[PDB]
Design a protein around this nucleic acid. Structure first.
Lengths: 48, 286, 670, 48
RNA sequence: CUGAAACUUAAAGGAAUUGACGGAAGGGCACCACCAGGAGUGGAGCCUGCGGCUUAAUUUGACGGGGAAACUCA
């Protein structure tokens, strides 16, 4: 389980340009930070 | 041929892809699809395909697939276009084209700047097309060496005009409001210009430069004023020049003097009262 | 450098006991805000979702398990706000009832409460016109820990097997909007009443981020101190909740506005407002001195061509040497050959169907405009620019306009909002004079004439919300925008719409656009709201430095709920670099077709319209760019070229842009 | 989307049979009524 | 000498089979290539075709049977 931190607009070119709509998340139990993919949203209007 | 109206159909990404093509085509012989996809450093395959299709339907990139080897080939007009974009990055070319004079290896159009002043251009199409690399490379180096010749002639007080840039084999020159003697009919002060035109031969040969094709069609005469008739003599003999250390300069020199005396005895009916400038005095002058 | 680590078993149990030592330490330090003897304040708001419930019955059914008659005997007669202390769990409670005749009052109740309790009926189904929008509006304004509960389960048939099916129906309904909880609880069961009383006493409520980063006081006693005949001093006795209050920052009051502080007094020190006060002005006078370097004062009157000279032609000089030759009766041709020298509910439904016609045509033809032969496009299109690519051209914010509001120059311009909001939360946690959980005496500089509009603090709430640095100062800001479900009624970009972001409400005419990221930060101005995706809405509004959610409405008093809730959104950015430009499309039909050049019909009606518009590129709705060739006919007929070969089913379009600015803001009352 | 609260059971295209009758419908679709398409077994044919 | 881990990556590699590409080489074999020439063009005026300029239109492709005041006319 985690608490979100930021909005990561990473651009990733070859071969497919993935417009990465993904969220940096701080976990709870250990206090280290991982990146995290948000599926199926075209807009990411849900994970604020 | 060259139809310059079509390169403004291209976006920023299209000549970014064209810059990737000219970067990848100078390392190998034929550049394929993934070197254009990778050397460009841009995001998507789709934009590369759209830009390559934009150059293809404008006949700037030729698609070739010789048995499982996809590749692309630059024509003359694409490298003319990217040279004019890197001329636009040097913020001077703005609006191009009236064809005045078609040479063998250099075609002359009529251009302008952002300031709106009248200028011209010198393209270089060596071979006109079975494109390789030697033709366009030799056009590029010929344009470069005539740019250094052009700057060296302008820097030494001659009546040879001002250069600006040597953007690949595309050479941008100042327009001169000048007339040839095919159009010119009669002049008031013919011996003064004849003195200026032997003095031009004298200080070229003192510099060591021997302009050989020095016919009537060479001399361009600017008319600065209409009330006082101020004059300037523009000489275009740039690929036919030969050095003073060459072995066959003697009949070139007396041919230049013989042509100027026969052209001034034919049309304007003016005879040289001083003697002709012979080769050895100019040889010791350099 | 340093050798490898071999962690032993004793080092591992030291690791575990140290992490659990500090973690039980700060969990206790988070839980010592709720010392239920003296220093505790828990806020309960009980709202029922149908017309036919009385919330004092829910209060009755909950506190019959605490077994205290005399508190209710005090609580019957005429009181609405209560301060109940329980000895069963040793916690201090404060319970807020809403007035059901005002929706904004219910919003004010639940936006301050640490617990929101939803009352439900086992007899009547909840309203899709009242209670659903209660659920959605509170849901989008932000809810802490919530309780869902029933009180009409005895009113159905007394066999309990029928009652558990009703309980499962309430559970399936309450799971649809609150998936954090799964059980709808009963007040008719005494042990379940003990369970929900235990959860409202003991459980840590979750923190709503926007309100707990500014600090807020709920008020129990209001008193007034006269200082001047025009303005005096309010007295507020309450408990501070949040990040705290400073004597220099401004404080917002709902339905009253922003006010400035005089002095503070804690009883559980005395501090005062020094020379570092935030002034009660909406535009900072230092913002006049910020915009000192004007760059673009480009005039449009002395232009032979359009503003495309960064990407088009050269300025063409036309030295007109007009000399008149007089034979009696002569056209322009012979005179050109002679002297050549070479050197109220009906109005509402009316505006409703004309605007609905506008977005249905705007859905069909996006941003086209028609030209008559009588009207000439010369004086119509002075201010438009015909740039080839929107996302590559170089605009600037600094450009002037005769359509400018004069207070655009006096605007608060933040460079990076990301560093600014983290900075403002770190000093507003640093020099907080009073930390939360203290009984505070708070004094407000306040004008005399607004004292009629206050109410009894035990009959109506008095929420006190602090604001951050420069929060009263205006700027151009941005909001996200998503339309609510089953809302197909149109909104254009110029009508008064009141935004509820935070506790302040402000009437605005917001600019509508699409949030596609640009290298030059330009965006497409759309005339109406996009019905499919999340649009974006920037405007001139006071700044909010906590990214609070925004709810969008207009007051519609035709319904019993006198509010038309439009959509929702969030405070995105306060940027002056983000700019908007409309696109004008002039339609045209390609008349005759040929391998190289295409004759185009019905584009303009004059040749000099083509001569002025000789620079601007053409594009086709089929996806093909083009350029014009020569003005052929006197009726606006011209020749044009294209990238390929078009048919009779394609249409020629022409893009023109002029810059659109946001509109100012005013607060809303009632 | 949001169900109305009257979901209490106690106190458009035609619907599709389920359970054993669906297995009947698949049997008579595939083997009782074999659709001879281009010498092959085409499931889901279009306009052809 | 002994010898990791975090992390990153869908290929790295072995044998074998063909050959676009050659500005490697060698032949043919051509007055749309050259030598031997001849007639010339490009130099002068004029006709025509394309481009340019102007136009209200110089309709228009790359010789279009596109010879030409009404027609052909687009």
């Amino acid at each position: 389980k985690g608490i979100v931190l930021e909005k990561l607009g990473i651009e990733s070119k070859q071969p497919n340009s993935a417009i990465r709509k993904c969220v940096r998340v701080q976990l709870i139990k250990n206090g280290k930070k991982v990146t995290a993919f948000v599926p199926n949203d075209g807009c990411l209007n849900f994970v604020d | 041929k060259l139809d310059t109206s079509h390169m403004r159909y291209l976006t920023t990404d299209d000549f970014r892809v064209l810059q990737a093509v000219e970067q990848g085509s100078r390392s190998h012989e034929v550049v394929p699809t993934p070197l254009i996809h990778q050397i460009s450093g841009m995001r998507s395959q789709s934009g590369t395909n759209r830009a390559i299709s934009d150059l293809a339907k404008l006949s700037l990139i030729s698609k070739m697939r010789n048995v499982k080897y996809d590749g692309y080939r630059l024509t003359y007009n694409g490298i003319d276009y990217l040279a004019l974009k890197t001329m636009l990055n040097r913020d001077t070319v703005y609006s191009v084209g009236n064809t005045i004079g078609v040479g063998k290896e250099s075609d002359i159009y009529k251009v302008s700047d952002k300031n709106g002043n009248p200028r011209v251009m010198k393209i270089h199409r060596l071979g006109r097309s079975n494109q390789g690399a030697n033709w366009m490379h030799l056009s590029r180096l010929a344009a470069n060496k005539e740019y250094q010749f052009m700057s060296m002639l302008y820097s030494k007080g001659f009546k040879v005009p001002e250069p600006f840039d040597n953007s690949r084999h595309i050479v941008v020159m100042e327009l001169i409001e000048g007339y040839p003697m095919r159009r010119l009919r009669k002049h008031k002060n013919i011996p003064k210009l004849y003195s200026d035109l032997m003095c031009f031969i004298v200080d070229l040969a003192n510099s060591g430069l021997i302009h050989c094709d020095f016919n009537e069609f060479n001399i361009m005469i600017k008319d600065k004023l209409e009330d006082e008739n101020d004059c300037g003599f523009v000489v275009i003999d740039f690929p036919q020049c030969i050095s003073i250390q060459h072995q066959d300069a003697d009949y070139y020199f007396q041919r230049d003097v013989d042509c100027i005396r026969r052209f001034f005895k034919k049309k304007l009916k003016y005879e040289p009262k001083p003697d002709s400038s012979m080769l050895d005095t100019e040889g010791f002058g350099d | 450098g340093k050798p490898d680590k071999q962690v032993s078993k004793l080092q591992r149990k030291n690791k575990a006991k140290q992490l659990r030592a500090q973690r039980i330490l700060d969990s206790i330090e988070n839980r010592k805000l709720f010392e239920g003897k003296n220093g505790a304040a828990k806020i309960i708001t009980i709202v029922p979702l149908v017309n036919d419930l009385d919330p004092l019955d829910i209060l009755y059914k909950l506190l019959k398990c605490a077994d205290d008659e005399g508190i209710m005997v005090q609580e019957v007669d005429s009181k609405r706000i209560f301060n109940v202390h329980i000895k069963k769990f040793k916690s201090n409670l404060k319970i807020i009832i809403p007035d059901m005749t005002n929706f904004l009052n219910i919003l004010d109740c639940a936006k301050v409460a640490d617990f929101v309790v939803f009352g439900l009926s086992g007899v009547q189904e909840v309203d899709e016109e009242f209670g659903e929008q209660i659920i959605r509006a509170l849901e989008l304004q932000g809810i802490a820990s919530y309780i869902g509960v029933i009180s009409n389960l005895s009113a159905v048939h007394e066999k309990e097997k029928f009652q558990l099916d009703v309980k499962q129906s309430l559970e399936s309904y309450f799971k649809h909007f609150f998936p954090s909880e799964e059980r709808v609880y009963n007040l008719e069961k005494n042990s379940d009443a003990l369970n929900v009383l235990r959860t409202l006493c003991q459980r840590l409520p979750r923190s709503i981020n926007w309100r707990d980063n500014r600090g807020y006081v709920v008020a129990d006693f209001v008193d007034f101190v006269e200082t001047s005949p025009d303005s005096g001093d309010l007295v507020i006795e309450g408990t501070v909740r949040g990040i705290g209050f400073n004597a220099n920052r401004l404080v917002h009051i709902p339905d009253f506005g922003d006010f400035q502080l005089n002095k503070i007094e804690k009883i559980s020190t005395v501090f005062e407002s020094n020379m570092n006060r935030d002034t009660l002005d909406e535009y900072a006078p230092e913002g006049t001195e910020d915009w000192s370097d004007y760059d673009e004062d480009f005039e449009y009157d002395g232009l032979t061509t359009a503003r495309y000279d960064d990407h088009g032609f050269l300025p063409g000089r036309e030295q007109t040497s007009k000399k008149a030759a007089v034979p009696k009766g002569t056209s322009d041709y012979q005179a050109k050959w002679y002297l050549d020298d070479v050197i109220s509910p009906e109005e509402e439904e009316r505006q409703l169907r004309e605007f609905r016609d506008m977005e249905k045509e705007d859905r069909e033809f996006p941003d086209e405009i028609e030209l008559e032969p009588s009207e000439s496009a010369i004086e119509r299109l002075k201010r438009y620019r015909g740039l080839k690519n929107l996302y590559n051209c170089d605009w600037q914010v600094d450009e002037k306009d005769p359509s400018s509001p004069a207070e655009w120059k006096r605007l608060l311009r933040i460079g990076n909002y990301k560093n600014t909001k983290n900075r403002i939360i770190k000093e507003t946690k640093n020099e907080a004079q009073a930390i939360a959980g203290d009984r505070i005496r708070m004094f407000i500089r306040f004008p005399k004439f607004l004292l009629e509009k206050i109410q009894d603090p035990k009959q109506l709430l008095f929420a006190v919300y602090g604001l951050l640095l420069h929060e009263h100062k205006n700027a151009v800001v941005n909001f996200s925008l998503q339309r609510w479900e089953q809302y197909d009624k149109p909104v254009p970009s110029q009508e008064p719409i009141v935004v509820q972001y935070g506790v302040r409400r402000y009437t605005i005419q917001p600019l509508f656009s699409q949030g596609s990221n640009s290298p030059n930060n330009v965006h497409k101005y759309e005339r109406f709201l996009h019905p499919d995706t999340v649009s974006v809405a920037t405007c001139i509004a006071p700044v909010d430095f906590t990214q609070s959610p925004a709810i969008f409405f207009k007051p519609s008093p035709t319904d019993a709920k006198n509010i038309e809730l439009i959509g929702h959104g969030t405070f995105l950015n306060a940027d002056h670099s983000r700019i908007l430009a409309k696109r004008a499309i002039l339609t045209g039909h390609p008349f005759r077709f040929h391998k190289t050049v295409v004759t185009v019909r019905y584009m303009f009606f004059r040749p000099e319209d083509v001569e002025w518009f000789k620079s601007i590129p053409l594009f086709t709705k089929s996806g093909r760019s083009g350029f014009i060739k020569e003005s052929l006919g006197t009726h606006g007929y011209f020749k044009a070229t294209f990238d390929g070969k078009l048919s009779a089913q394609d249409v020629v379009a022409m893009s023109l842009y002029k810059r659109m600015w946001p509109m100012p803001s005013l607060p809303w009352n009632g | 989307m949001a169900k109305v609260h009257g979901s209490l059971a106690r106190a458009e295209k035609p619907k599709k049979p389920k359970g054993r009758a669906y297995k009947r419908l698949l049997y008579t679709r595939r083997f009782v009524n074999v659709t001879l398409v281009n010498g092959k077994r085409r499931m889901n044919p279009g306009p052809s």
